[PDB]
Amino acid sequence: DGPEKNYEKTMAILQIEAEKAELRLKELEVRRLMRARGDGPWYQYPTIDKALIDHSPKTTPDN
C-alpha cells in the first residue's frame, strides 16, 4: 500500500499506547492515594454496621 497508510496507523497506535501509559501512571497514583487516605470507593475495609445497635430502653438507666 501507500507509505501514508503505515504513517497514519503508526500515529493511531502511538496515540493509543501513550493514552495507555498515562492511564497506567494515573491508576497507580490513584490507588496509592486511595490506600493512603481511604477516602475513595477502593480500599473501603468494612466496619461494624450501626443497624445492629439496639436503641431500646435497657435495664439500667445510665444505658
Binding site: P57, P61, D62, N63
Partner: protein, 50 residues
C-alpha cells in the same frame, strides 16, 4: 416495710416516681435528676405519713 406497702405506694406515688424514671432514662446522668429524686422521697414520706 417497703414491700408491704409497695402495691399501694406504686399507685399513690405514681406521678413523681414516673417523672424521675423518665428523667433518669432521658438525661442518662444522675446529676441532671437530683431535684426529681428529692421529690420522690418527699412524696414517699407523705405516703407513709397518711
Amino acid at each position: 416495710v417497703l414491700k408491704a406497702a409497695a402495691h399501694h405506694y406504686g399507685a399513690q406515688c405514681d406521678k413523681p416516681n414516673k417523672e424521675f424514671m423518665l428523667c433518669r432514662w432521658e438525661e442518662k446522668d444522675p446529676r441532671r435528676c437530683l431535684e426529681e429524686g428529692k421529690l420522690v422521697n418527699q412524696c414517699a414520706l407523705d405516703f407513709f405519713r397518711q
